């Protein structure tokens, strides 16, 4: 709904699914904060 945290890599696939792969804290999430 707003901000994107630094360290967040957006690993996207053509299916239309963005899925989070943060290289810093090492975390994975389907909820994208930019939306």
């Amino acid at each position: 709904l707003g901000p994107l945290p630094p360290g967040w890599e957006v690993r996207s696939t053509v299916s239309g699914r963005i899925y989070f792969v943060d290289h810093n804290n090492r975390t994975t999430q389907f909820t994208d904060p930019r939306l």
Binding site: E9, V10, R11, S12, S15, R17, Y19, F20, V21, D22, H23, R26, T27, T28, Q29, F30
Partner: peptide, 13 residues
């Protein structure tokens, strides 16, 4: 979609 995979560095055009 299903539960999220492990983390990789991204392929994004």
């Amino acid at each position: 979609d299903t539960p999220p995979p492990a983390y990789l560095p991204p392929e994004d055009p």
